[PDB]
Amino acid sequence: TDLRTWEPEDVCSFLENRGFREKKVLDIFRDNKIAGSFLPFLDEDRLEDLGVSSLEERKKMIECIQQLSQSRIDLMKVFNDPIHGHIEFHPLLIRIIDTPQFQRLRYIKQLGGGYYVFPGASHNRFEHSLGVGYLAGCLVRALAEKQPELQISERDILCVQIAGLCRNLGHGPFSHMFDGRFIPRARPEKKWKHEQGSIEMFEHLVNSNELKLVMKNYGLVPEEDITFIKEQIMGPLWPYKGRPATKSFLYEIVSNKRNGIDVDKWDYFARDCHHLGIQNNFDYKRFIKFARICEVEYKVYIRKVKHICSREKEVGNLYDMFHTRNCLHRRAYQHKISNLIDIMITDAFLKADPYVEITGTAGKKFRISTAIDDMEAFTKLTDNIFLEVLHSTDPQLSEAQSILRNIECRNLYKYLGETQPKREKIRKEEYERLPQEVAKAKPVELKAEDFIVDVINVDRVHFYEQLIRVYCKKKDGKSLDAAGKHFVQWCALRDFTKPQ
Ligand SMILES: Nc1nc2c(ncn2[C@H]2C[C@H](O)[C@@H](COP(=O)(O)OP(=O)(O)OP(=O)(O)O)O2)c(=O)[nH]1
Ligand SMILES: Nc1nc2c(ncn2[C@H]2C[C@H](O)[C@@H](COP(=O)(O)OP(=O)(O)OP(=O)(O)O)O2)c(=O)[nH]1
Ligand SMILES: Nc1nc2c(ncn2[C@H]2C[C@H](O)[C@@H](COP(=O)(O)OP(=O)(O)OP(=O)(O)O)O2)c(=O)[nH]1
Ligand SMILES: [Mg+2]
């Protein structure tokens, strides 16, 4: 048999019939519900902690467990990812992965509207999240072996990997459209990041699936490590509570928003390039091989910290990564039509939002905009809501449907052009005015509603602009000319660049 099949008392009987017949030690394993699957992941120190005080019996115990057919690596699971090839995962990670909370990521397109411009970009958050987890694992392993003085444990590594896996837990339908266009527009009062949803959903994941006990049984300390995991995804003398200041570098793996160099970017760069038809100059594996924890000393009292570093000549590599970042952003992410589709889906969602009910915990109904408040409602919120609306028989959604039908028949708002501000920029709060301005700027009646203005924001490491697109809803030729020249005049008026 496998140890997977063994209940805790089966393990206890195995322990007994192998020579450990003392009630207290059996009580340990009965108490912690240590099913068989955990056995090959047990340590001398783990057995010490669990509470066997026999300096010799720990060794005997581990010998007994070693003599079994099945080993540690024999319980790891192998994914075959077209980006990273095959991928080993520690069973705990699988247990996190095999939950509604996480499986839900299979039903959210990574590039959202992108799929409707790049037919290759059919990929969802799920596979990318797996990827990120794996990469996190890779970098932390590499640093662990190159520098054993770092005292980096299995615990730490798994926490980093789980943070990796679960960073994108809280993305809404069509990914960044939802949190970047829909929510800000539907709930202007509330500031919301997909990360907030990520950590909330992680909490909901482990609580729904009761994985805390499992985490404990595989040698994690839920109380500390969950806070560590959360902190890695979210953020904040030493601010963090998850780990001591001495292990600061660990926080630079999963989400390094400081200098924008993390494994999330690596994975989705590679993946998105794989699916788009672009190819990525940035070789992360050679960032990893050239990676070192290093001691940085800057005086502000002198501040000495352990940061992740790359050799001096891996600066040319970083030139690529930031080019690939822009390369992708320029061509694909802020693609004029992809964004148009995101805008139209947003518009549909907005006009669908009042009528669509989505049940959460205890079956309380939530609107599309408020599902973010309850994870068990949010768990049911996916891209599929697109098709639910489109196919709904309710005549209240005529408005929302009609937009979705237009998306289906490629009857999209036509893109008049792009422009740049010569000096200054547009205040985040100034936006709602812009469609009025463009409409009223005359060179046919053209309402403020007929126009959409899309504002786009272009956007250390240690060694050892604004784009404005205008779209018009009215698609007929006369109005098209009128709108075009309206746009040009608006550009001239605000002293903007020559339109595209
Ligand atoms: N279709 C489309 N996708 C976008 C746009 N902006 C960002 N994305 C997608 C492209 C990336 O594959 C994906 C990365 O999101 P992550 O949650 O992994 O990273 P993060 O939260 O730092 O967002 P960011 O790096 O700013 O894109 O977001 C956009 O304007 N249009
Ligand atoms: N028309 C269309 N394009 C798709 C589809 N899937 C991916 N794409 C790509 C091919 C197109 O080059 C790209 C943009 O499509 P559009 O025809 O809507 O571009 P645009 O509105 O500028 O129209 P135009 O090319 O000026 O007639 O989207 C699809 O189902 N229909
Ligand atoms: N490699 C690469 N692919 C692109 C680029 N822009 C779009 N694509 C992809 C997505 C589309 O499915 C296809 C061609 O899209 P285009 O932007 O060239 O034409 P689109 O109809 O979107 O705009 P258009 O009306 O022709 O100005 O190739 C690009 O700049 N580089
Ligand atoms: Mg086209």
Residue numbers in the entry: 72 to 307, 316 to 379, 385 to 527, 533 to 548, 559 to 563, 589 to 624
Paper text:
The sterile alpha-motif (SAM) and histidine-aspartate (HD) domain-containing protein 1 (SAMHD1) is a dNTP phosphohydrolase that restricts viral replication by limiting the cellular dNTP pool. The active tetramer form of SAMHD1 is induced by cellular nucleotides, which bind two allosteric sites of each subunit. The SAM domain is not required for dNTP hydrolysis and viral restriction by hSAMHD1, but is essential for these activities of mSAMHD1. To better understand the regulatory role of the SAM domain, we crystallized full-length mSAMHD1 in three different states (0, 1, and 2 allosteric nucleotides bound).
